[PDB]
Structures are given as C-alpha cells and as structure tokens.
C-alpha cells in the first residue's frame, strides 16, 4: 500500500559504506574512520580531520523548500563526558549548513541537539538532554535511536528509541536551502578524546508519524541478535559483569564455590565520579560471567535469541560452571558455582533470551533447564533470611524485572577503571 520515502539509506553492503536509496548518492569516506570489526554498520568518528564522511546529494533531493516535510533517524553511541571542558562546547557531528541555512545535528555535555536554520537567519532547536549524575543511564555511552522530524505548518520533533522528547514549533521558519552535502565529522569540539559511533543513517521525504517511527525502532534493533548493556551484540567466551534490573544497586558474588555455596546480590555498589562532571553506580563489580557455547552449531561467537549455552562464573582467574540440583525442595532452586569437571548430571543448560520492549534497551532473560530439556525456570533471586540468592524459578515463567539481566564488558566510553 506504500511508497519508499527514505531518500538516503546509508549502510554497508557488499564490501563497502554505500546509499542503498534510488538516488545512489556518493559516499567519501575519510582515512581515520573506525569500523567495529563484528558489525561494520557500527562506524567511529575521531576528534581529528580525517575522521570524516561526505555524502554527495543528488540535486533532486538537495532541500530547498519553504513547506517541504522531512526527517532523518540513525543510532549514535556516544562516550561519557569526563571532563570540563567539555561543559558549553556544542560541537556539531552531522551537518547540512550552507551559508547559515539548512539542518545540522550537533552535540553538547548531555545533549543531543537539531536544528533548523532558514535563510533570514531564523533558527529553532529541539533537545534531548540526558544526565551524567543519575546511578544507571539508558543514555550514556550506550546505543540510542534517534529520530527527528519536521513538519513544516507545525512542529519539529526529536524522538529517542521510539518516544517523544521534545516539539518545538517551526512554522514562522521561511525557505530553508541546506547543503549540498553531509559532513558526518565532530566539528568545534574541544575534547581531543571525543568520539562517537554511528549507524543507519537515514534521510526521509516525509514527516515520520509515531508508527512508523516505532517500526523502525523494532526493526533496526536486530531482536535476533542478544545484546549487551552498551547495545552491541552479546558475545560467546567473553567476560561480562552482571546488573540485575530488579536490584541495580547490587552486584554478583559467591559466597564459596561447590555445592554448599550459592551465588547472591550484594550492594551497595558504590559510585564512580568527576565532580561536576558525572557521578554514577560503579558497573564493573562482582564475579564476571562467560557465556559457553552448548547446542549452537553457528561457527562465529555471537549470542542469538534462543540459543542454549552454559553460563561460566569466574572466580579468583579461574571458571567455574552455574549450576544447580532441581530436587532441591521449593520452586526456587539456589545456583551455585561448581568445578566445571565436577558438574555431573546438575542443570546447568540455560536458553539465552532477548527481551525488547518500551523500557531499559537490551534486556537479557535466562532460561535455565533439565537434562532432558524442561524448563527449571528463568535465573533471578530469591530473598532467603536477608540473603538475596541466585535462584532458577517457575515463579517468573508463569508470568518481571527480577529475571531480567545486562551483561556489561568493560568500554573506554565508561571510563572506570575496575577495583582488580
């Protein structure tokens, strides 16, 4: 029933950073650009000249247009702010400007910014800010969609992972004659360490309607793919801390290895700070979980929704295996972490899960199972006289955030340096 009305869709492809739209506009990619080497959409732009990329317009679509309605969406990750100098430095990263005209997204110390520009030198803004003093950000440092759109008899409007943020009117706005080009590059940022990632950049030739907007959200979210607490994907035979959604200000440990021990919560988890900068919950704490391939035959280590793993703990340079006796009396069954030689016939296979919904991005369930394949339950606690033990339950089945877990790697755009 429908129209493409993306007028520059730009991704990689056979090989190469290209604009998959019917207009097939060129692509000049600088000699300091970044490419995560798991996901080459996932591009990384430097605070340096040659950390740069220029897509040549078709003229057909260059804007110039006093009632024409357009928008533009991609995802951007973008790394802590650390230091004051940072603080009132906006700093432009995708910019459509020509002589004070047109459409530019830049950034600031916990904003994302639009803005429009005619050619009488009448601007709007729409913002997104974010908190660096907050314990657990959805935002910072982690992957965000973006969305913007402009309808030019009313409002412009910024939407972050498919939810209204700000509007702001723009109808006093006359001709606005942007760019030939986008320039993706960090233009007047004073940070020499700044950087950002992004990905799916995409022009439309239309105002987005919250629908539309929401599809996007799902469809280039990758539910397939696990994902970990930054938003990349979640990965086989790699150490990870654990935050629990339920009790975020706690973190893993085990109180002995065996059978006679048990994995639990404790907190608090203690902060990580700049004064005036940022001050957050400490995320690298507690024992590190490994994700262990079990049924999957892909031959990459990539975690895909419904794959069957075993969960490693490491414990003093050491992996052990989470594990637990299921005849144990009561619906939770205690998780403890056994010498992996020692495992015997103890449920230990777990049925790794996606979770998307309108919430925190990248939730992870864990389905632990039997020998024979029925479910045990899903892995959250149990409060068992003051102590908040790792448990396998039915309980969450039949059914929460208790269940519901992240897998944070230690990342350069988080800063903290781990206690050991």
């Known amino acids: 029933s429908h129209m ?33 080497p798991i996901d080459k959409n996932q591009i990384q732009l430097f605070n340096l000249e040659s950390s740069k990329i220029e897509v040549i317009l078709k003229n057909a679509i260059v804007y110039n247009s006093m009632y024409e309605n357009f928008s533009t969406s991609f ?22 400007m020509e002589n004070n005209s047109g459409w530019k997204v830049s950034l600031n110390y916990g904003e994302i910014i639009w803005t429009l520009q005619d050619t ?16 657990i950000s959805d935002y910072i440092n982690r992957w965000i969609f973006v969305t913007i759109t402009n309808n030019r008899l009313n409002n412009s409007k910024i939407y972050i992972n498919g939810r209204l943020i700000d509007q702001k009117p723009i109808s006093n706005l006359g001709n606005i004659h942007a760019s030939n080009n986008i320039m993706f590059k960090l233009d007047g940022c004073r940070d020499t360490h700044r950087y950002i990632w992004i990905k799916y950049f995409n022009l439309f030739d239309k105002e987005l309607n919250e629908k539309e907007i929401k599809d996007l959200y799902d469809n280039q979210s990758n539910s397939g793919i696990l994902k970990d607490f930054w938003g990349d994907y979640l990965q086989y035979d790699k150490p990870y801390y654990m935050l629990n959604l339920y009790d975020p200000n706690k973190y893993v440990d ?98 790794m899960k996606s979770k998307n919904d309108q919430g925190i991005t990248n939730k992870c369930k864990m389905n632990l199972q039997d020998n024979n394949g029925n479910d045990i339950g899903f892995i ?41």
């Open 4 to 36: 493409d009305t993306s007028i520059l869709n730009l991704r990689y492809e056979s090989n190469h950073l290209i604009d998959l739209s019917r207009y097939a506009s060129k692509i000049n990619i600088g000699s300091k650009v970044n490419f995560d």
């Open 75 to 96: 995802w951007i990750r973008i790394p802590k702010y650390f230091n004051s100098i940072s603080l009132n430095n906006e700093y432009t990263i995708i910019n459509c």
């Open 120 to 135: 009488q030198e009448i601007k709007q803004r729409v913002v997104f800010k974010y908190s660096q003093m907050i314990n």
């Open 254 to 351: 085990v109180n002995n290895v065996g059978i006679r021990g048990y994995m639990y919560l404790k907190g608090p988890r203690g902060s990580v700070m700049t004064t005036n900068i940022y001050l957050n919950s400490s995320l690298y704490r507690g024992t590190k979980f490994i994700i262990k391939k079990y049924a999957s035959g892909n031959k990459d280590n990539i975690v895909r929704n419904n794959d069957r793993v075993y969960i490693n703990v490491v414990v003093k340079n050491k992996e052990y295996r989470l594990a637990t006796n299921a005849s144990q009396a009561g619906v939770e069954k205690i998780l403890s972490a056994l010498e992996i030689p020692d495992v015997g016939n103890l449920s230990q296979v777990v049925v």
């Open 380 to 420: 959250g606690f149990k409060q068992f006289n003051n102590i908040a033990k790792l448990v396998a339950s039915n309980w969450y089945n039949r059914q929460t955030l208790g269940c519901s877990w992240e897998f944070i790697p230690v990342d350069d755009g988080w800063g903290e340096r781990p206690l050991q």
